[PDB]
Amino acid sequence: KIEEGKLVIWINGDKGYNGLAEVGKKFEKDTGIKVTVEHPDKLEEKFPQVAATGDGPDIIFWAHDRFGGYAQSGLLAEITPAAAFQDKLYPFTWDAVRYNGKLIAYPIAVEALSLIYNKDLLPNPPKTWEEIPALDKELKAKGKSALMFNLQEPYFTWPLIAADGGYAFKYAAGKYDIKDVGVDNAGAKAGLTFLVDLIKNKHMNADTDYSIAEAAFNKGETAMTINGPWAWSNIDTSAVNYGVTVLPTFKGQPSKPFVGVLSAGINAASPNKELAKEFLENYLLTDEGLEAVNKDKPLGAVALKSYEEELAKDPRIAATMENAQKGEIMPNIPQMSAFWYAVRTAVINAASGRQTVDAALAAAQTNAA
Ligand SMILES: OC[C@H]1O[C@H](O[C@H]2[C@H](O)[C@@H](O)[C@@H](O)O[C@@H]2CO)[C@H](O)[C@@H](O)[C@@H]1O
């Protein structure tokens, strides 16, 4: 079903799909080959469906945690670029895209969450989570909440959990110990506990998705949020005054957000295996190609060494790096498919209050399998 001769590209609707579209015309200009850009839903789950029955895109863009899962199922393209090309990118980004001594994806960007605040409505930041229960009331004397952020997803709620020692899989002898999961440890339980007890005093709401958080800030209904560099485009153009800084201290310990790497590979069935390699190596990963993508919807700390240290200036990005290096990198193994949903469940359950904090989690230890 994958057609012989052309390119179709898959990337999420929060990154730059209008920036990556403009890059397509320079590729259509020289070689004459067609390059369509797309942004479907549940593409983390749609890809290993369409690929597992001989379909799907030429190229897919996502955090590196799924690609080891796609390398297991056997629906990827093993990339073999020259080592001189691997010398142009920060070496550690390849240690993400290497499941079992062999290559499967190019790295493009380095992601991490960072505290954004409404400099206008709230001048200085809180440095513990602990003071937000007092911070809420003062702004709630003007119809405005302290913090709001997507609670439904685990990516945003994990930073707070990890702080006090909350871990997916224990780091035992190079590889990851699957058999010791740590979502239901004493530190993690108390982390989640604080997210729930924030909500129980109406200082956040339980069912606040992504769209509500963004909009609420981007106009001004609330004075804080937790989001990536990708949301700086809409904030800038919605004309808000905002700094970026550290993700603050749960129990005098730093939030450890899971550090993703926006990476890309090619389909197993695909007949255009060297067509994407000429597109990837030459056009996109450049100080012209990564510019127009960063223009539309920022990536922050890019993987190509040359363009990264040209835009390392912005205190926003530096602060994004500060969180990132203080947090830890996402593991790549297959069960990271299952790990994310185990918590995704357990969070919402206790978040609203449907279940006890301890039961939802001590269940979710089982779910990671
Ligand atoms: O922790 C899992 C949770 O976060 C990540 O999703 C991120 C993704 O990493 C970013 O590149 C961007 O797309 O924002 C996403 C959240 O909306 C995980 O990759 C994914 O399992 C899940 O969303």
Side-chain angles (χ1 to χ4, degrees):
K1 313 290 108 192
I2 297 156
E3 195 135 48
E4 202 165 35
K6 72 207 192 98
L7 284 177
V8 184
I9 296 160
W10 271 18
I11 184 165
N12 199 25
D14 64 336
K15 313 269 211 334
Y17 73 89
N18 298 335
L20 210 73
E22 291 168 34
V23 172
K25 189 163 184 185
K26 200 78 180 73
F27 203 80
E28 254 199 293
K29 177 173 161 183
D30 297 320
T31 56
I33 313 305
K34 203 65 156 71
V35 180
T36 303
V37 185
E38 289 181 329
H39 50 99
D41 281 44
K42 292 175 170 182
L43 74 102
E44 61 257 45
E45 302 148 26
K46 195 166 201 162
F47 182 79
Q49 258 206 332
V50 300
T53 54
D55 209 330
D58 281 277
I59 312 166
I60 184 163
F61 270 50
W62 199 249
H64 75 266
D65 60 317
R66 298 274 166 153
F67 288 76
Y70 307 158
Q72 185 81 338
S73 303
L75 314 166
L76 279 181
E78 175 162 351
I79 52 150
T80 62
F85 182 80
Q86 297 162 39
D87 293 317
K88 334 166 74 164
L89 279 47
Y90 278 85
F92 78 151
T93 59
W94 290 97
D95 289 27
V97 306
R98 176 174 277 93
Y99 191 53
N100 296 15
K102 297 148 201 175
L103 291 181
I104 52 169
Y106 292 124
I108 310 295
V110 186
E111 307 182 342
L113 291 157
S114 315
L115 192 74
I116 309 159
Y117 58 96
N118 200 333
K119 273 178 83 213
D120 297 343
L121 276 54
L122 180 60
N124 244 54
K127 286 295 202 169
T128 56
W129 284 72
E130 279 90 315
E131 83 189 66
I132 297 162
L135 208 81
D136 189 60
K137 196 230 265 268
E138 199 198 60
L139 302 175
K140 281 278 180 69
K142 12 206 267 217
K144 307 196 182 280
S145 64
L147 170 63
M148 265 167 63
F149 71 102
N150 184 13
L151 308 185
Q152 310 301 252
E153 284 279 300
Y155 189 64
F156 301 86
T157 61
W158 183 265
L160 176 55
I161 292 165
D164 224 86
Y167 55 93
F169 299 115
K170 230 321 177 196
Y171 198 37
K175 72 218 79 183
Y176 303 85
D177 184 28
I178 62 176
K179 294 138 208 286
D180 185 30
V181 177
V183 296
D184 66 340
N185 70 65
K189 289 172 174 177
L192 171 52
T193 303
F194 194 73
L195 194 71
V196 176
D197 296 357
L198 260 175
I199 297 159
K200 284 184 172 165
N201 302 2
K202 315 172 200 163
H203 302 331
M204 283 195 293
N205 336 107
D207 65 339
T208 176
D209 82 81
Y210 195 95
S211 190
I212 293 171
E214 187 171 40
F217 185 104
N218 288 31
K219 292 149 187 206
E221 253 164 25
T222 180
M224 271 196 291
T225 179
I226 293 171
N227 231 304
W230 55 82
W232 304 347
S233 275
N234 299 8
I235 298 161
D236 281 332
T237 40
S238 61
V240 191
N241 185 25
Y242 70 108
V244 175
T245 192
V246 74
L247 285 164
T249 54
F250 174 49
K251 287 303 204 193
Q253 270 285 305
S255 321
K256 292 191 281 190
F258 253 133
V259 172
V261 184
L262 196 77
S263 296
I266 303 153
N267 226 319
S270 184
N272 314 324
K273 292 180 152 66
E274 309 268 336
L275 218 181
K277 201 190 173 195
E278 195 179 337
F279 176 79
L280 286 151
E281 293 195 321
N282 309 344
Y283 289 72
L284 178 53
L285 278 153
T286 51
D287 304 48
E288 291 133 341
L290 290 177
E291 180 154 14
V293 171
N294 195 77
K295 284 207 153 186
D296 188 46
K297 306 292 163 179
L299 318 191
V302 306
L304 167 56
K305 293 185 198 198
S306 60
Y307 199 59
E308 195 278 321
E309 300 182 354
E310 192 171 26
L311 301 179
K313 191 214 320 306
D314 194 38
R316 321 191 294 195
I317 285 168
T320 322
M321 221 147 81
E322 193 162 312
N323 287 298
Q325 301 290 76
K326 281 187 166 169
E328 302 222 63
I329 305 153
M330 282 201 263
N332 69 295
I333 65 154
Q335 290 89 318
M336 289 295 290
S337 176
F339 157 70
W340 268 161
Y341 308 150
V343 181
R344 199 151 89 178
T345 285
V347 167
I348 290 157
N349 293 4
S352 39
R354 305 202 252 214
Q355 203 165 41
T356 77
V357 181
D358 297 56
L361 294 172
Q365 183 86 340
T366 327
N367 296 342

